[PDB]
Design a protein around this ligand. Structure first.
Ligand SMILES: CC(C)(C)OC(=O)N[C@@H](Cc1ccccc1)[C@@H](O)CN[C@@H](Cc1ccccc1)C(=O)N[C@@H](CCC(=O)O)C(=O)N[C@@H](Cc1ccccc1)C(N)=O
Lengths: 99, 99
């Protein structure tokens, strides 16, 4: 689909068998989701954005479904004000910036 | 042009008669540029992103040229680790998210 940018490009994602809603961030290297219950063993990490670095829990090989498309990638879980779909996954559903 | 997301979508911008380079952020509501010399009177503001809020200096009616296209908008200047081209301007050069 073609998403314009007059409204925040929010997209519904199904991850962990839960229904969420995520921002499509092209400035985000990683996909960082809010706090939630996720299966498997993880590892502690630290990411930075405008404002500072946050300690997030990292998960690899994680299936997620953004607007119907499936993609198995690494998801960071931490105190993010909004779910963020970054390039690690945006590339998997084949997303482009056309202007 | 069509920009893929395997590499950070960096784009060269000419603002304030200076040559810069900015990230194309679709998750950014505002266009926030690093510290620099800019003409006109401004106003103090505060924006938040993953990590916290930062006190930035706001400027309105500001011409900028992203990849050759011109657009007069509001630019926030503050301690941002990287120049960010947000939706306030991304909409002006007619940018879309196609996946
Ligand atoms: C998550 C991680 C993988 C670490 O990537 C980044 O943080 N990337 C950021 C750039 C970067 C990368 C690497 C190193 C340094 C810096 C940027 O692209 C993130 N994009 C969005 C992510 C986001 C959006 C919305 C909510 C939370 C988070 C953003 O900062 N957006 C800010 C940019 C600053 C700005 O324009 O103000 C924004 O639009 N903030 C709005 C909306 C908002 C809502 C809630 C709270 C605070 C702010 C605002 N009003 O200030």
């Amino acid at each position: 689909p073609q998403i314009t940018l007059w409204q925040r490009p929010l997209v519904t994602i199904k991850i962990g068998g839960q229904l969420k809603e995520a921002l499509l961030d092209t400035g985000a290297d990683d996909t960082v989701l809010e706090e939630m219950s996720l299966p498997g063993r993880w590892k502690p990490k630290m990411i930075g954005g405008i404002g500072g670095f946050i300690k997030v829990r990292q998960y690899d090989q994680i299936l997620i479904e953004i607007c119907g498309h499936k993609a198995i990638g690494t998801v960071l879980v931490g105190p993010t004000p909004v779910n963020i779909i970054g390039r690690n996954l945006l590339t998997q559903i084949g997303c482009t910036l056309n202007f």
